[PDB]
Amino acid sequence: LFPPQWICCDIRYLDVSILGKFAVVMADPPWDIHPYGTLTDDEMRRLNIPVLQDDGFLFLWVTGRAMELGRECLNLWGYERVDEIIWVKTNQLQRIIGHWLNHGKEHCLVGVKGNPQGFNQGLDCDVIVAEVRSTSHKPDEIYGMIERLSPGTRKIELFGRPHNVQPNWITLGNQLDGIHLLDPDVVARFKQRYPDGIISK
């Protein structure tokens, strides 16, 4: 269970019912806002997010018109938006790095489903100040806030890249290197669902 796990896959076609239930879901979708790997608005609506959690939180990165489309998806999938994290993007000297204003931040919606119990709400605040890395690399600080919020629990990241794999997390994305599963329950259900190790439409 505990060490990093991941599945190289097309998230549109993976049967996510094999993965079980998660205290936290995080997604950084390739929204159709203006690209290879883009999902249309309908594909995002149809993602089977609802099977992934009974009680917990969803972290959904949004930009441009996905500020509104992500809210639509959040509600369609069964969540209520209860917070919004902004990451203020800095250089190495802590200076700050949409056609009306220059953009100093990225947004991450925070949704809740059910009635999560035993989370450490209010330990962190809703502003991240962290350095920009490569194009579209989210700050690692978010994993720390999520771990302090829900220590030790199972988490799943959608549309992650190899540098996103973390202990306690299962990472899904089509640029990951193969399949690396260690949780025996997930291994069992994966082999039954995918006896030949292939994930097709």
Partner 1 sequence: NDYCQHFVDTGHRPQNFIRDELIRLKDELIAKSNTPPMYLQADIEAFDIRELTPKFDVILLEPPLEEYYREKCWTWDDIMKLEIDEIAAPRSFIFLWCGSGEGLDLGRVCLRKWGYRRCEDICWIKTNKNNPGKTKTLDPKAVFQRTKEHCLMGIKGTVVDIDLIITEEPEIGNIEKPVEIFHIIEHFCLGRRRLHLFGRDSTIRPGWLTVGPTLTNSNYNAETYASYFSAPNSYLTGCTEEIE
Q: Which residue shows structure tokens 């489309």?
A: 69
122 binds, among partner 1, ligand UE5, none (CB under 5 to 8 A by kind): partner 1
Count of positions on this chain that bind partner 1 (CB under 8 A): 44
Q: Which residue shows structure tokens 């996510």?
A: 16
- 21 annotated binding-site participant: no
Paired residues of 61 in beta bridges: 108
The number of beta carbons lying within 10 Å of the beta carbon of residue 12 is 14
CB of 78 to partner 1, least distance (A): 15
| Identified binder of partner 1 from the candidate list 90, 153, 174, 183, rule CB under 8 A | 90
CB of 157 to ligand UE5, least distance (A): 10
- 85 annotated binding-site participant: no
What's the longest Cα–Cα distance across the chain?
Answer: 53
34 binds partner 1 (CB under 8 A): no
CB of 141 to partner 1, least distance (A): 5
3-class secondary-structure state, position 189? helix
3-class secondary-structure state, position 86? strand
Identify residues after which the chain is interrupted (C–N over 2.5 A): 34, 97
Residues within the interface to partner 1 (CB under 8 A): 57, 67-68, 71, 80-86, 88, 90, 93-96, 98-105, 107, 110, 112, 119, 121-130, 141, 144-145, 148-149
